[PDB]
Design a protein around this ligand. Structure first.
Ligand SMILES: Nc1ncnc2c1ncn2[C@H]1C[C@H](O)[C@@H](COP(=O)(O)OP(=O)(O)OP(=O)(O)O)O1
Ligand SMILES: *[C@@H]1c2c(cc3ccc4cccc5ccc2c3c45)[C@@H](O)[C@H](O)[C@@H]1O
Ligand SMILES: [Ca+2]
Ligand SMILES: [Ca+2]
Ligand SMILES: [Ca+2]
Ligand SMILES: [Mg+2]
Length: 341
DNA sequence: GGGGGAAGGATTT
DNA sequence: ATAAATCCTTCCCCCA
């Protein structure tokens, strides 16, 4: 199999640069203003200019403005970035019917029936980079390898504006030298658990007793890494079918007053049904971020579809189930629909 | 013992 | 101190 993976460079920030090229070159910071007080919220992402000084996705907008007080701060415009993404994702389809849109700025292409070797594939990668740069003025990074995992790892090594190929040869090398924490699907918690087991490279999973590995990181993960270590991993590229859709919103101020939260909750539901579009959910979940940032959710499933009206009533029931089973004040509140028909 | 499915916390991104 | 989704593990009914 030959898989070409595409990841848009500092997407949100870049899109802003595209709609305002004067920004090009200066440090740009896209933020999510939570409005609980002037400049509350976080940095969704920043371009490399700003990234260069520690301003990056995740940090508080306040911290940011301290390091780069004179950087361009813009509010996140998801809808806009969503539409650009959509235009680019379509250009990608021109190159393969077998495409797997993984995220708003990531796509997997199975180009097995398009090229014969990595040289051809590499070229196709450049063709694609030029197409997107031309059509949308957006730079991306291309990762190419035998499976999705390595195609992604490739992109990771090459971004920004790069392109890399990991041949069957280097794959083998990487299975022995790559820091296992850098493997897709392995976050801090798993990486940590692995370190404790003397497993720092993929290959290490082959020399450890399975059941001991399973008991630590779980059967799914254990199998996943082992298949990678055995150079046997090779899941097919598949159309992504959104299994759940929801919206979560931060409140002006903490609270556990059902009447003070409802607005946020309903708002979340509305934004959700709009996103649902045609999709009818049978399950619903309410999620709340408590004041100490712990997360609590309560849901319910129905034997039939759910009308928006139902969602409203039912979501309030769940909100209360939360409010009564947890004494902490709520900070952020959301709803999540799933099990579509 | 385990299929099957529901629920809630865990983990990744 | 943003936000969106999927992934494990647990509990529970019950097997014709
Ligand atoms: N709190 C956080 N801590 C660390 N990383 C974060 C945090 N919040 C978000 N991020 C990550 C997810 C962001 O939406 C992602 C953003 O941007 P982009 O401009 O595409 O990046 P990129 O190409 O370097 O990486 P990527 O595509 O993986 O997101 O950075
Ligand atoms: C959102 C959130 C938080 C922490 C992290 C940490 C590392 C991340 C790496 C890549 C992507 C990413 C996306 C969202 C994150 C990330 C990361 C928390 O601080 C916060 O409470 C949210 O869960
Ligand atoms: Ca990207
Ligand atoms: Ca990692
Ligand atoms: Ca908890
Ligand atoms: Mg990405």
């Amino acid at each position: 199999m030959i898989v070409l993976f595409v990841d848009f460079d500092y997407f949100y920030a870049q899109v802003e640069e595209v709609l305002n090229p004067s920004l090009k070159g200066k440090p740009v910071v896209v933020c999510v203003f939570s409005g609980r007080f002037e400049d509350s919220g976080a940095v969704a992402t920043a371009n490399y200019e700003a990234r260069k000084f520690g301003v990056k996705a995740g940090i508080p907008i306040v911290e940011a403005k301290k390091i780069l007080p004179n950087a361009v701060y813009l509010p996140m415009r998801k809808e806009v970035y969503q539409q650009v993404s959509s235009r680019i994702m379509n250009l990608l389809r021109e190159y393969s019917e077998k495409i797997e849109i993984a995220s708003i700025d990531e796509a997997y292409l199975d180009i097995s029936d398009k090229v014969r070797d990595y040289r051809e594939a590499y070229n196709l990668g450049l063709e694609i980079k030029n197409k997107i740069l031309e059509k949308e003025k957006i730079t991306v990074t291309v990762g190419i390898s035998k499976n999705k995992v390595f195609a992604k790892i490739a992109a990771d090594m090459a971004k920004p504006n790069g392109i890399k190929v990991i041949d069957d040869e280097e794959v083998k090398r990487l299975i022995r030298e790559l820091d296992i924490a850098d493997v897709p699907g392995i976050g801090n918690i798993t990486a940590e658990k692995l370190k404790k087991l003397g497993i720092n490279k993929l290959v290490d999973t082959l020399s450890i007793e399975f059941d001991k590995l399973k008991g630590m990181i779980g059967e799914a993960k254990a199998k996943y890494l082992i298949s990678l270590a055995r150079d046997e991993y090779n899941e097919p590229i598949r159309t992504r079918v959104r299994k759940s859709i929801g919206r979560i919103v931060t409140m002006k101020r903490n609270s556990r007053n059902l009447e003070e939260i409802k607005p946020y909750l309903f708002r979340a539901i509305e934004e959700s049904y709009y996103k649902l579009d045609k999709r009818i959910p049978k399950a619903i979940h309410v999620v709340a971020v408590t004041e100490d940032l712990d997360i609590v959710s309560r849901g319910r499933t129905f034997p039939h579809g759910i009308s928006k009206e139902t969602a409203y009533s039912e979501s309030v029931k769940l909100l209360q189930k939360i409010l009564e089973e947890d004494e902490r004040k709520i900070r952020r509140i959301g709803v999540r629909f799933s099990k579509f028909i």
